[PDB]
C-alpha cells in the first residue's frame, strides 16, 4: 500500500484521500517521517501540510500531477514547525493559495518558516470562521486549543471517517508526546480531548509522526498530556 515516489511515500486512505509522507534526518531523532493529506474534491485537489522541504513539496506536486492530474486549489498547514510548513515556498512558486492559523503566520518568521498567504481565524467554539476558509470543500478546520504548540489546528474530511490531528496527536502505542518545546503543558490534555469531541464520528485518526490509528490515539495522547500538568 505504500507507494514509493523518490524519497516520499504515498498511501491511499479512502477513494479521494491520500497520505503523503516525507522524511528528514534530524540529528538525535533519526530519519523522522511526517505525514500530511491530499484530497480530491471534484475537479480540484486540496493539500494538508507541506513536506519538510521545498524540494520534497515540489515532489508532492509532481506525484499529484502524475496520479490525479487536477489543479491544486489550496493548501492548509497545521502549525509553524518545519514538518508542516517547511515547503511553503514551493507551493507559492507553483501558484497555490496557502492558508494557516493567523497565529501560525504570526509565529512563522521567528520559527524559521515562510508564512502562508491567508490567515484563518476561529470562533470561540474552535470552528474556523467560514469567511477566512473560503472554498475549502470537504475540509472542516478546527482549533482545539493550545497543545503541541499554541497555534496547532486540525482538519476533518467530510464524506469520510478521517480526521487529521497533525502533531497534536500521537499513536496509541507512542512512548512520549515528542517535541514539547513549544507545548502548552497546562492545556494540552484538554485540547487533545477537544479534537476528539469535534470529530466524534472519525474512526481513522491521521497524525504527523505515526501511521493512521483508531480513536485510542486520542485518549492515549490525552493521558500522556495529563502527566504534563
Ligand X SMILES: C[C@H](CS)C(=O)N1CCC(CC(N)=O)CC1
Burial 42-66 (b: 16+ CB within 10 A, else e): eeebbbbbbbbbbebbbbbbebbee
User: Residue 73: is it exposed, middle or buried by C-beta count within 10 angstroms (0-12/13-18/19+)?
Assistant: middle
Q: Which stretch binds ligand X (CB under 6 A): 12-20, 80-88, 135-143, 185-193?
A: 80-88
Subset of residues 185 to 224 that bind ligand X, contact rule: CB under 6 A: 209
Asked if 208 interacts with Zn ion (CB under 5 A), we say: yes
119 binds ligand X (CB under 6 A): no
DSSP 186: T
Shortest spacing between CB 161 and ligand X, in angstroms? 24
**Other C-beta atoms within 10 Å of 69: how many?**
8
How many other CB atoms are there within 10 angstroms of residue 3's CB atom?
12
83 binds Zn ion (CB under 5 A): yes
Query: From residue 32 to residue 71, what is the string marking binding to ligand X with x (rule CB under 6 A)?
Result: x---------------------------------------
Specify the pairing of strand 30-41 against strand 44-48: antiparallel
Of the candidate residues 167, 190, 198, 218, the single one contacting ligand X (CB under 6 A): 167
Identity of the residue, 32 or 97, whose beta carbon is nearer to Zn ion in the bound complex: 32
Residue numbers at the binding site for ligand X (CB under 6 A): 29, 32, 81-83, 167, 178-179, 209
Residue numbers at the binding site for Zn ion (CB under 5 A): 81, 83, 167, 208
Amino acid at each position: 500500500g505504500d507507494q514509493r515516489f523518490g524519497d516520499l511515500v504515498f498511501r491511499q486512505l479512502a477513494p479521494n484521500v491520500w497520505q503523503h509522507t516525507s522524511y528528514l534526518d534530524m540529528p538525535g531523532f533519526g530519519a523522522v517521517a511526517s505525514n500530511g493529506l491530499i484530497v480530491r474534491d471534484g475537479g480540484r485537489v486540496l493539500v494538508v501540510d507541506t513536506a519538510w522541504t521545498d524540494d520534497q513539496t515540489a515532489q508532492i506536486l509532481n506525484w499529484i500531477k502524475q496520479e490525479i492530474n487536477l489543479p491544486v486549489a489550496l493548501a492548509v498547514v497545521t502549525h509553524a514547525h518545519q514538518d508542516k510548513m517547511g515547503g511553503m515556498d514551493a507551493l507559492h512558486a507553483a501558484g497555490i493559495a496557502t492558508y494557516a492559523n493567523a497565529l501560525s503566520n504570526q509565529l512563522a518568521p521567528q520559527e524559521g518558516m515562510v508564512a502562508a498567504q491567508h490567515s484563518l481565524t476561529f470562533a470561540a467554539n474552535g470552528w474556523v470562521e467560514p469567511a477566512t476558509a473560503p472554498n475549502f470543500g470537504p475540509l472542516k478546520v478546527f482549533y482545539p486549543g493550545p497543545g503541541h504548540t499554541s497555534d496547532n489546528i486540525t482538519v476533518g474530511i467530510d464524506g469520510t471517517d478521517i480526521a487529521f490531528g497533525g502533531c497534536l496527536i500521537k499513536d496509541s502505542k507512542a512512548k512520549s508526546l515528542g517535541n514539547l518545546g513549544d507545548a502548552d503543558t497546562e492545556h494540552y490534555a484538554a485540547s487533545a480531548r477537544a479534537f476528539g469531541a469535534a470529530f466524534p464520528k472519525a474512526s481513522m485518526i491521521v497524525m504527523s509522526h505515526s501511521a493512521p490509528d483508531s480513536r485510542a490515539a486520542i485518549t492515549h495522547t490525552a493521558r500522556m498530556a495529563d502527566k504534563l500538568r
